Design a binder for this molecule. Structure first.
Ligand SMILES: C[C@H](O)COCC(COC[C@@H](C)O)(COC[C@@H](C)O)COC[C@@H](C)O
Ligand SMILES: [Cl-]
Ligand SMILES: [Cl-]
Ligand SMILES: [Cl-]
Ligand SMILES: [Cl-]
Ligand SMILES: [Cl-]
Ligand SMILES: [Cl-]
Ligand SMILES: [Cl-]
Ligand code: NI
Ligand code: NI
Ligand code: NI
Length: 944
């Protein structure tokens, strides 16, 4: 029996005769975008209004429907959707008959198993499988902490955490991507949550006896207890600061005073042959060895543990020695594992969500990755312009403790002529017992408006922290609570926070606009009136109480406006930021707002928000990981992204020592100076080349002049990259402009610009920063060089020396401490400006246009006032640059557009780099041909 077909204004709806899926709907969303919804019922009305997707079915996109035999074809000018009338499965082809994406079945619905709260009768766990046996690459999915760039053949858990941001937009190496529109925890690859080690492995203790691993408890170096445990688990608190599983009385005290250390020893045995995944969740110091070799070596501060993963091929029956050393230092630990999927499911695309009413996704065709990202922006909203200053240098601290401290640090930068735009006030400016009141403690912040006025008189901006957190004693808590907008379970649980004796606290429910409107009005009345420029919306996972099980985290958010916590687990940040963004629009409809927030989801970019990777650690491995973290965030369609340069929490050896608390580097124990300075030097280098450039963290102090003394190599190196950031502002703000006007992506995985170079896909230590710069951060202590793969199909220039190199090879790039290896793509046209201390000083600046010869080029410099919403009414300009390598001619074309404050006349000089030159980065002094530009096209010829 064949499925019945109904033609609609938006596409078609099939009614399937047999199977769990009763109806399959296709909706045309754009020339390149088709929505697929598989429904285990007859009423599409049960699918909740999307949080990610703001787009509606198109009304101006022609499409055709042809039905013949057992196939129905729906197509637009760019996409063909072929649907089986036998089983309702969909296959997508491009305009030229190429198969991009093929459903392997009609999808799997099954009972919700990860929702601690009562589950609706029409809610299910969902899974959809595509493209079995495909060799494609997969990218995006957001910000993850396991170094993955090409996810193909691996697992990714799309959850929400301090360190992890899920954006369920998937990009293929093929000419498509897809938005999976589900708000609950989602899994790419294996649909199963990782298991305890003994669920699908045989365990043997240190003596070979089956049953569990040998566990040794040491106090200092004295062994206190040995025993065999099937599942060593100290992963979460059940409540307050009490573990679900306490330590034995022999060592419980040692846990509390950090003298405890533990060893696990035994053997593991696969029951099935194939690729197994292992995940070591921990804070404190952990090292794991397999077959006598160290596989993982990690540290995180106790209160912010995470999973550290590896995959390994195992044969059924084989025994492998496992050794773990773990010094908890008050932290957490659990070892997890997944055995191979069934044969046919191992090489395929699989997406699964914990709870939903239907399988609901959007197929997005695109000839380039930029095109695919554009489909994401069309579905979930434009990346609205940040203020230009958001792209300048940010200085932050956990935490500045008074107005004077803020002013003094900003002034110190200005006094040292180190460029800076923004400074940040972290938590705790309010009276101690009044978190949520948004009042300023008179003792430390006596006059918040005077504070803002001084920052502004120094031509800088100030951002201030605001959490979703309220103490029940505050008027603000009470106003929100009276309308049912507070998640009060955390009060019932009596989970006290870390301040003083500890305070009862709750987080509000941002899932209805009525709630977010109140939240906004409160900060409008208390904080916005003082002139603060930006909102640091922290802890928006939400992190109501750290280190509870994820089930408890779900439960704490029940009930909410959209249902259970499990149903919207990944989506908190969007409605929250949106309330603030909409509030700002209603307040001043001509000033760009700015939000920095610690979580995200599809659509976050429509709220004028950047996101950051949260409380990472001052560790090389973390620094390395931030590369994949940013690449995946950008490939998921969210480009304004950043991190704490230097990491958030350093190890104790950095935080104090023989002289007590370490503020300035001068207080470090002598033997810690070198690494502290080197790590920060490398991390500043890296940070200068991510979308937002921001120093932040717990002590030591992170200002450049607190990391090292003036005149030193490291001080000079940090200053040089900060200055370079500003020299590049014409280039960088062009990228900033493109994020909005061209659905642009700033921090680019190599697959974006080298889609046909299969070797480039997997790389997780390099990326393109805009169209010109191949960035290659140094992530190893003491390294003075590193391998750099130069993508094929282009030649490359050493940015610092002018040396030209052929593409399609790996080199050992020179990487002295003072420099990060940087290469420029031939044909690049890079505009720089003069040295400036903050962005507005650079408005209408003289320009140096540097052409990197050897191929044609094209770059249109975007400029506008940098602050207002006028760009939305067309107030902006582009100065088009195009280079023809055959004739050696750079054309500065007719200026497009204009804006209030724009200079009609510009001094522009042009130079060409074709090889080694001593002036490669001497912008001010380089020989260049000068032109007086007045908006009309001029041509500059390369010198013979
Ligand atoms: C000790 C255990 O409760 C962890 O405290 C971590 C903590 C980090 O502060 C970060 C700042 C608010 O941005 C408080 O918890 C923050 C989590 C919940 O995001 C700092 O605790 C400092 C000691 C000295 O009290
Ligand atoms: Cl001066
Ligand atoms: Cl000034
Ligand atoms: Cl100034
Ligand atoms: Cl003002
Ligand atoms: Cl100045
Ligand atoms: Cl100035
Ligand atoms: Cl000035
Ligand atoms: Ni002002
Ligand atoms: Ni100590
Ligand atoms: Ni100035």
């Amino acid at each position: 029996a064949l499925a019945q077909v109904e033609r609609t204004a938006e596409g078609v709806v099939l009614t399937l005769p047999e199977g769990t899926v009763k109806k399959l709907r296709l909706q045309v969303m754009g020339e390149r975008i088709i929505r697929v919804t598989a429904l285990p019922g007859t009423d599409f009305g049960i699918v909740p209004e999307s949080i990610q997707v703001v787009a509606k079915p198109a009304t101006n996109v022609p499409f055709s429907v042809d039905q013949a035999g057992e196939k129905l074809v729906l197509k637009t000018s760019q996409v063909s959707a072929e649907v089986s009338l036998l089983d309702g499965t969909v296959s997508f082809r491009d305009a030229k008959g190429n198969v991009l994406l093929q459903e392997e079945n009609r999808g799997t619905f099954s009972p919700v198993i990860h929702d601690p709260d009562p589950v609706d009768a029409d809610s299910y766990a969902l899974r959809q499988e595509f493209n079995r046996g495909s060799d494609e690459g997969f990218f995006g999915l957001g910000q993850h902490q396991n170094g993955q760039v090409n996810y193909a053949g691996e697992n990714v858990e799309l959850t929400t955490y301090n360190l992890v941001i899920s954006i369920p937009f998937l990009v293929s190496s093929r000419n498509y991507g897809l938005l999976w529109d589900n708000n609950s925890i989602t899994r790419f690859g294996d649909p199963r949550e990782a298991q305890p080690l003994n669920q699908s492995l045989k365990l043997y203790d240190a003596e070979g006896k089956e049953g569990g691993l040998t566990v040794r408890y040491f106090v200092g170096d004295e062994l206190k207890l040995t025993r065999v445990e099937a599942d060593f688990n100290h992963q979460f608190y059940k409540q307050g600061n009490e573990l679900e599983n306490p330590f034995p009385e022999e060592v419980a005290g040692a846990y509390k005073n950090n003298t405890l250390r533990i060893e696990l020893e035994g053997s593991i045995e696969a029951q099935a042959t194939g690729k197994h995944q292992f995940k070591m969740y921990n804070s404190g110091y952990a090292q794991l060895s397999l077959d006598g070799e160290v596989v993982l070596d990690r540290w995180r501060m106790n209160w912010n543990p995470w999973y550290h993963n590896f995959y390994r091929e195992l044969n059924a029956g084989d025994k492998h020695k496992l050794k773990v050393s773990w010094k908890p230092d008050g932290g957490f630990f659990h070892l997890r594992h997944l055995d191979p999927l069934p044969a046919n499911e191992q090489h395929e695309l699989s997406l699964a969500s914990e709870t939903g009413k239907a399988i609901d996704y959007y197929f997005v065709a695109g000839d380039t990755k930029d095109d695919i990202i554009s489909g994401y922006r069309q579905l979930t909203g434009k990346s609205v312009m940040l203020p230009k200053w958001a792209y300048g240098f940010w200085q932050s601290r956990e935490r500045y403790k008074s107005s004077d401290e803020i002013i003094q640090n900003l002034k110190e930068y200005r006094d040292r002529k180190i460029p800076i735009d923004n400074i940040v006030l972290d938590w705790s400016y309010w009276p101690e017992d009044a978190w949520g009141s948004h009042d300023f403690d008179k003792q430390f912040f006596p006059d918040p408006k005077a504070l803002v006025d001084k920052v502004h008189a120094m031509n800088a901006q100030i951002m201030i922290s605001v959490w979703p957190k309220f103490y029940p004693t505050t008027d603000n808590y009470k106003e929100l609570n009276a309308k049912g907008f507070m998640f009060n379970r955390n009060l019932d649980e009596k989970n006290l926070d870390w301040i003083g004796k500890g305070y009862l606290n709750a987080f509000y429910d941002p899932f209805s606009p009525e709630a977010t409107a109140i939240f906004w009005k409160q900060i409008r009345d208390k904080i916005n009136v003082h002139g603060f420029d930006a909102w640091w919306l922290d802890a928006v996972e939400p992190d109501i109480h750290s280190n509870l099980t994820f089930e408890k985290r779900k439960w704490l958010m029940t009930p909410n406006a959209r249902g259970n916590g499990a149903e919207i687990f990944n989506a908190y940040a969007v409605p929250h930021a949106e309330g603030v963004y909409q509030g700002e629009l209603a307040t001043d409809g001509d000033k760009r707002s700015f939000i920095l927030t610690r979580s995200g989801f599809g659509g976050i970019q429509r709220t004028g928000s950047a996101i950051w990777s949260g409380d990472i650690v001052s560790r090389w491995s973390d620094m390395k990981d931030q590369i994949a973290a940013g690449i995946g965030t950008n490939l998921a369609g969210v480009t304004n992204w950043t991190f704490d340069i230097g990491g958030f929490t350093p190890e104790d050896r950095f935080r104090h020592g023989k002289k007590g608390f370490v503020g300035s580097w001068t207080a470090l124990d002598a033997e810690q100076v070198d690494e502290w300075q080197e790590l920060n030097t490398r991390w500043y280098q890296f940070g200068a080349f991510v979308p937002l450039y921001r120093s932040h963290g717990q002590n030591p102090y992170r200002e450049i002049f607190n990391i090292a003394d003036e005149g030193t190599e490291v001080y000079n190196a940090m200053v040089w990259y900060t200055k370079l950031r500003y020299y590049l502002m014409p280039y960088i703000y062009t990228l900033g402009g493109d994020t909005y006007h061209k659905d642009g992506t700033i921090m680019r995985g190599l697959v974006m610009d080298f889609p046909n170079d299969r070797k480039a896909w997997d790389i997780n230590t390099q990326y393109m920063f805009g169209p010109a710069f191949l960035v290659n951060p140094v992530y190893e202590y003491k390294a003075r060089s590193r391998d750099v793969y130069l993508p094929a199909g282009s030649d490359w220039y050493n940015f610092y020396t002018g040396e030209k190199l052929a593409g399609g090879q790996t080199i050992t790039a020179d990487a002295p401490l003072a420099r990060v290896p940087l290469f420029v793509k031939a044909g690049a046209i890079v505009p720089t400006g003069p040295l400036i201390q903050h962005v507005d000083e650079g408005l209408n600046s003289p320009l140096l246009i540097t052409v990197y010869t050897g191929a044609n080029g094209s770059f249109d410099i975007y400029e506008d006032d940098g602050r207002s919403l006028k760009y939305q009414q067309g107030e902006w300009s582009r100065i088009p640059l195009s280079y023809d390598d055959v004739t050696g001619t750079l054309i500065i074309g007719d200026r497009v557009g204009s804006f209030t404050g724009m200079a009609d006349e510009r001094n522009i000089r042009v130079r060409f780099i074709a090889g080694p030159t001593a002036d490669a980065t001497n912008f001010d002094k380089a020989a260049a041909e000068a032109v007086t530009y007045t908006g009309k096209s001029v041509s500059i010829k390369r010198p013979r």
